[PDB]
Amino acid sequence: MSEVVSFSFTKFNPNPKDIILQGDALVTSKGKLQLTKVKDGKPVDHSLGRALYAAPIHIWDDSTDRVASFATSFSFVVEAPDESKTADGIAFFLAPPDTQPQKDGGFLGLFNDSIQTVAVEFDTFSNTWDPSARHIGINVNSIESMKYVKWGWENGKVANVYISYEASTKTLTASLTYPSNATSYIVSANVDLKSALPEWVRVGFSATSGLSRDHVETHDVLDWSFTSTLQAPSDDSN
Amino acid sequence: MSEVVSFSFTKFNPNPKDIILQGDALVTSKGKLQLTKVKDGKPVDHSLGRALYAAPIHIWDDSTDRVASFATSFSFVVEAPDESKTADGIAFFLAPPDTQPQKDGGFLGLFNDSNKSIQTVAVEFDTFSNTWDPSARHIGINVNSIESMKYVKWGWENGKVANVYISYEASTKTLTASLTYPSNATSYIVSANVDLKSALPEWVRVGFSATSGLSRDHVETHDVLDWSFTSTLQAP
Amino acid sequence: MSEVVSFSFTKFNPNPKDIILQGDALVTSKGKLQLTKVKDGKPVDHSLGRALYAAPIHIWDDSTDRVASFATSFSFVVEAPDESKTADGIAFFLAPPDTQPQKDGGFLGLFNDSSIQTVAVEFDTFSNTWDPSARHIGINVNSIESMKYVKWGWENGKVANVYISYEASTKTLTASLTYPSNATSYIVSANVDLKSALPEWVRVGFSATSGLSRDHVETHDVLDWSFTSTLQAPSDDSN
Amino acid sequence: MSEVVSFSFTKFNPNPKDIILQGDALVTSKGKLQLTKVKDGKPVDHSLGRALYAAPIHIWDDSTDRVASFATSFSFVVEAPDESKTADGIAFFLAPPDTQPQKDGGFLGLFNDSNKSIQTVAVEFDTFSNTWDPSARHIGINVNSIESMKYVKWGWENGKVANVYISYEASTKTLTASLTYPSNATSYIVSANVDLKSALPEWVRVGFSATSGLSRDHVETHDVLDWSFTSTLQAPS
Numbered sequence: 001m002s003e004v005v006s007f008s009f010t011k012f013n014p015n016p017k018d019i020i021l022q023g024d025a026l027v028t029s030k031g032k033l034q035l036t037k038v039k040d041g042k043p044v045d046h047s048l049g050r051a052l053y054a055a056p057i058h059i060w061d062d063s064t065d066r067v068a069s070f071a072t073s074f075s076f077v078v079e080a081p082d083e084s085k086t087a088d089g090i091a092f093f094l095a096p097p098d099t100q101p102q103k104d105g106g107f108l109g110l111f112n113d114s115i116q117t118v119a120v121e122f123d124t125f126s127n128t129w130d131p132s133a134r135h136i137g138i139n140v141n142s143i144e145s146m147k148y149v150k151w152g153w154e155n156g157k158v159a160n161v162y163i164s165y166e167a168s169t170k171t172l173t174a175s176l177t178y179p180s181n182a183t184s185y186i187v188s189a190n191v192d193l194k195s196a197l198p199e200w201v202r203v204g205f206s207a208t209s210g211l212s213r214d215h216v217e218t219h220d221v222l223d224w225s226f227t228s229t230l231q232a233p234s235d236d237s238n
Numbered sequence: 239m240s241e242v243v244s245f246s247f248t249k250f251n252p253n254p255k256d257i258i259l260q261g262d263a264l265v266t267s268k269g270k271l272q273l274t275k276v277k278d279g280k281p282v283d284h285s286l287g288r289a290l291y292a293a294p295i296h297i298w299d300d301s302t303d304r305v306a307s308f309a310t311s312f313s314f315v316v317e318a319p320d321e322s323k324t325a326d327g328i329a330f331f332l333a334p335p336d337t338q339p340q341k342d343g344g345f346l347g348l349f350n351d352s353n354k355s356i357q358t359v360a361v362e363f364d365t366f367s368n369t370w371d372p373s374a375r376h377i378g379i380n381v382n383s384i385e386s387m388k389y390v391k392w393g394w395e396n397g398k399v400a401n402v403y404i405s406y407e408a409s410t411k412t413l414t415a416s417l418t419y420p421s422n423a424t425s426y427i428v429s430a431n432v433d434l435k436s437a438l439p440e441w442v443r444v445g446f447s448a449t450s451g452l453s454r455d456h457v458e459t460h461d462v463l464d465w466s467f468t469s470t471l472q473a474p
Numbered sequence: 475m476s477e478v479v480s481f482s483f484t485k486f487n488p489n490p491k492d493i494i495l496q497g498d499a500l501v502t503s504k505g506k507l508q509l510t511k512v513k514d515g516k517p518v519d520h521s522l523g524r525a526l527y528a529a530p531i532h533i534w535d536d537s538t539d540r541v542a543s544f545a546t547s548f549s550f551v552v553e554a555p556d557e558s559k560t561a562d563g564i565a566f567f568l569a570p571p572d573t574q575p576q577k578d579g580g581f582l583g584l585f586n587d588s589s590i591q592t593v594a595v596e597f598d599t600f601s602n603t604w605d606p607s608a609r610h611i612g613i614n615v616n617s618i619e620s621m622k623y624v625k626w627g628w629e630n631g632k633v634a635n636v637y638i639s640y641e642a643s644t645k646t647l648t649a650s651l652t653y654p655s656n657a658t659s660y661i662v663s664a665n666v667d668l669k670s671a672l673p674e675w676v677r678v679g680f681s682a683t684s685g686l687s688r689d690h691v692e693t694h695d696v697l698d699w700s701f702t703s704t705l706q707a708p709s710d711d712s713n
Numbered sequence: 714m715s716e717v718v719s720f721s722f723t724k725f726n727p728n729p730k731d732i733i734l735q736g737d738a739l740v741t742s743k744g745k746l747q748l749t750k751v752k753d754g755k756p757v758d759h760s761l762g763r764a765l766y767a768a769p770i771h772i773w774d775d776s777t778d779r780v781a782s783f784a785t786s787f788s789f790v791v792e793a794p795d796e797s798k799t800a801d802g803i804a805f806f807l808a809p810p811d812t813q814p815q816k817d818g819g820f821l822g823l824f825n826d827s828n829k830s831i832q833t834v835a836v837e838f839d840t841f842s843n844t845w846d847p848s849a850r851h852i853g854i855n856v857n858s859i860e861s862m863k864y865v866k867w868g869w870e871n872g873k874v875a876n877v878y879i880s881y882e883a884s885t886k887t888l889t890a891s892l893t894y895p896s897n898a899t900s901y902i903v904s905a906n907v908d909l910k911s912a913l914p915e916w917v918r919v920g921f922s923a924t925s926g927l928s929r930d931h932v933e934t935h936d937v938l939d940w941s942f943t944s945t946l947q948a949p950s
């Protein structure tokens with residue numbers, strides 16, 4: 001009646017055997033997780049890459065009415081040669097363990113037109129279902145976010161992300177901070193993990209570059225820490 | 239060289255030998271840290287309470303060029319009988335280890351209006367607009383002054399549980415504070431560049447401070463429901 | 475330059491996605507990891523079971539000269555209908571990520587009689603030709619023949635608490651067993667060079683076998699498990 | 714209903730505001746916790762030193778039926794100029810929060826035969842056979858007495874680093890202590906059934922105590938090199 005898992009990497013090892021790389025994703029010799037293709041130092045169009053931690057995570061348990069609380073921190077960089085033409089974005093996500101890459105472009109490698117996936121997206125291009133401004137969105141089994149906050153993307157600057165899920169209140173909270181100019185953004189939503197996802201999931205990142213040559217950008221993850229605890233609800237708190 | 243300290247309480251024992259209680263602060267029989275006085279269910283005016291963890295925390299070290307990264311989470315409630323008349327607020331803070339209560343009211347038990355500056359870094363949840371404050375209720379980052387270096391407007395929800403997370407990243411000197419109300423999934427965040435080495439001594443105590451208003455009609459509670467803290471002092 | 479991984483289960487979930495079950499191993503409805511076969515309440519002969527955590531662990535890195543330090547705790551029970559006829563044993567181990575079951579019987583599902591990379595701490599209940607006469611706790615480096623052991627007073631059906639630690643800076647592997655029922659304990663340590671014994675990445679877990687005769691039978695059940703490893707640069711300023 | 718505390722130091726800062734130093738204990742300029750006096754490079758007789766973590770630890774609560782489980786690890790050295798004449802030893806201990814140094818010499822700064830009312834639970838690394846001791850140097854588990862409830866013979870290695878791990882499993886009341894010399898891969902262990910609720914008050918301080926001999930020729934250092942402690946007080950399962 002307690003299961004706890006954590007991991008933390010201050011950079012990635014170039015051939016990381018505890019990370020499942022999908023699509024174009026790779027780790028560079030200097031330990032950056034380059035989700036979308038970069039060639040000759042330029043980001044390339046029509047790229048999709050994802051990365052998952054090797055172990056599935058026990059996020060809820062039907063036989064005991066436990067639901068996990070979790071938290072994750074990571075830093076990422078999106079750098080674009082043209083700040084007026086950026087696409088498509090990067091996300092943190094949870095999905096069934098055998099999850100594969102879904103539709104490219106605006107679907108971020110996570111969703112499709114035709115899917116259980118919960119995601120926090122950092123969305124750089126306004127699709128038909130998006131607000132006009134770049135945004136941080138919380139997504140539950142749809143590319144259309146259930147709640148978002150407008151996001152002032154800073155080209156090429158390190159973004160520090162912290163995401164937490166409080167099982168007792170069903171509250172998912174996502175924040176981004178730029179240390180370069182000490183500016184931050186936050187959004188929360190009420191999210192029921194038990195109805196959106198299966199009992200076991202893999203967790204990780206997904207990103208796509210645009211579907212035209214002139215809307216390109218990198219989606220690089222520099223470090224990552226994750227913890228989840230599946231335990232019985234407390235009867236005495238408040 | 240690494241020095242790591244962590245503590246977590248899902249609620250407080252009523253006689254907590256690892257918390258230094260100052261002023262009016264107490265723990266209720268149900269395990270809530272009641273910073274400011276409550277009589278017959280009503281919050282009382284002219285109250286000041288603080289609470290510090292017993293062990294000092296090593297936040298920087300001159301000889302080895304180290305500065306700590308830290309993070310803290312807690313939940314709190316501020317409950318007012320009259321939503322239009324609320325004072326003064328609650329704060330999480332770091333101060334020298336022998337820190338004692340400082341001025342009441344708008345000074346939140348943390349600062350004062352004398353010539354002598356005080357070493358204290360705080361994140362304040364401010365319910366009352368003093369001369370030095372913005373008009374709205376706000377979350378502020380305060381570095382050795384009751385006047386915040388940076389703040390965000392705050393939609394205070396009367397009697398609702400607020401979840402706070404505060405982190406400090408030594409490598410970029412970035413302090414970030416967030417508040418979320420799970421009851422309506424609404425959140426607020428503010429960050430600031432803060433140099434701990436210039437603002438504080440090498441060792442500090444950490445905890446909470448709160449004050450109620452200096453008029454009988456401007457009263458509210460300042461209760462902390464749980465608390466987790468971790469700090470790591472390690473080489474750059 | 476730091477990679478840290480930790481997991482802890484107070485009992486196992488009956489269909490555990492984050493455990494790779496091999497051979498006969500299964501988790502019971504009450505959350506026990508039953509490595510070797512039990513039919514109608516009795517342990518069965520010629521059984522081999524193993525179980526590994528799903529994530530590979532980064533135990534050394536050629537590029538930076540880091541070597542991990544790790545610790546693991548677990549509780550286990552070995553229960554036998556006949557105390558004078560026990561075989562073969564249970565082990566905690568580290569092996570390459572694609573590790574598969576190896577020889578049964580005295581080989582504990584880990585080694586064979588053929589070059590195998592596996593480091594193990596074994597709780598050995600039957601004296602093979604390479605064993606001391608008494609039951610024992612052994613530290614094993616790429617061989618079924620232990621590099622060091624301590625004689626072990628096995629208590630039939632009682633919970634045994636194990637603690638194993640590896641201190642990279644001294645290459646010291648330490649293994650202990652305590653029975654809380656009688657407050658009795660056993661310990662053994664060895665100097666083990668993980669870099670030369672194993673690949674950079676490994677999987678970790680348990681292996682056990684029952685006897686190769688109908689009458690030498692006993693359970694090998696694990697009740698909980700915690701593990702933590704840290705791969706970081708060596709400390710330059712400690713003692 | 715959970716209270717968790719953890720701290721770790723890879724070496725001690727020279728003016729450690731989170732450690733209460735008592736008696737002769739000091740931290741050297743290189744970060745070693747030197748519990749007993751050293752003068753001109755030589756350990757001095759009639760010395761007693763102790764050190765406690767600044768925050769009290771909540772080890773049981775009557776109202777909720779909780780008892781803590783804890784674990785601690787540390788390395789230490791005991792170095793003697795004359796291997797045939799060693800005294801008195803070093804210990805890890807738990808005591809009431811306002812604990813003060815008790816008798817010197819064989820009482821390890823922890824106990825006193827005059828007063829059996831002392832509350833203190835300890836794991837001792839005992840280098841000198843007193844009247845209440847076995848003959849050999851030994852690792853002992855002591856509960857409100859200098860006379861160990863359980864011990865194991867200990868092959869002390871002069872001036873070598875010893876790695877200690879101690880754990881307390883609340884649900885079975887099992888206290889387990891182990892010592893390992895990395896230098897020769899040699900280890901010792903002992904366990905005991907210990908009821909913390911009847912031995913100690915609800916809140917304690919934790920740390921170390923040591924003493925050097927009560928004669929000029931029985932002298933040895935008692936230095937702690939690091940430390941890591943965790944305790945969790947939570948509902949019984």
Ligand SMILES: OC[C@H]1O[C@@H](O[C@H]2[C@H](O)[C@@H](O)[C@@H](O)O[C@@H]2CO)[C@H](O)[C@@H](O)[C@H]1O
Binds near residue numbers: 088105106107127212
């Ligand atoms: O330009 C970036 C966007 O491309 C969109 O796809 C467009 C594409 O850009 C255009 O050249 C033509 O092929 O029509 C496509 C419609 O599918 C993506 O939908 C959008 O996400 C951006 O990546």
Ligand SMILES: OC[C@H]1O[C@@H](O[C@H]2[C@H](O)[C@@H](O)[C@@H](O)O[C@@H]2CO)[C@H](O)[C@@H](O)[C@H]1O
Binds near residue numbers: 453
């Ligand atoms: O009403 C809440 C505020 O009280 C202020 O104190 C005032 C007080 O309101 C007024 O009655 C006067 O007589 O005394 C004080 C003016 O010096 C506090 O200064 C302010 O922080 C609020 O708490």
Ligand SMILES: OC[C@H]1O[C@@H](O[C@H]2[C@H](O)[C@@H](O)[C@@H](O)O[C@@H]2CO)[C@H](O)[C@@H](O)[C@H]1O
Binds near residue numbers: 561562579581685686
């Ligand atoms: O009886 C338990 C031991 O069996 C040994 O295998 C024996 C087997 O028992 C015997 O019937 C005959 O087949 O010879 C085999 C090999 O000598 C295992 O080697 C030993 O590990 C025990 O399990």
Ligand SMILES: OC[C@H]1O[C@@H](O[C@H]2[C@H](O)[C@@H](O)[C@@H](O)O[C@@H]2CO)[C@H](O)[C@@H](O)[C@H]1O
Binds near residue numbers: 800801926927931
């Ligand atoms: O020599 C070390 C031990 O001294 C013991 O005390 C002795 C003392 O050495 C001696 O002078 C004698 O006359 O009486 C004392 C009691 O036997 C300590 O008791 C012992 O703990 C060591 O320190």
Ligand SMILES: [Ca+2]
Binds near residue numbers: 106123124125126130
């Ligand atoms: Ca989009």
Ligand SMILES: [Ca+2]
Binds near residue numbers: 327364365366367368
């Ligand atoms: Ca104010």
Ligand SMILES: [Ca+2]
Binds near residue numbers: 562563580600
């Ligand atoms: Ca054998």
Ligand SMILES: [Ca+2]
Binds near residue numbers: 801819839840841846
């Ligand atoms: Ca003695």
Ligand SMILES: [Mn+2]
Binds near residue numbers: 123
């Ligand atoms: Mn979007």
Ligand SMILES: [Mn+2]
Binds near residue numbers: 371372386
């Ligand atoms: Mn203010």
Ligand SMILES: [Mn+2]
Binds near residue numbers: 596604605606
């Ligand atoms: Mn053997």
Ligand SMILES: [Mn+2]
Binds near residue numbers: 847859
């Ligand atoms: Mn003794």
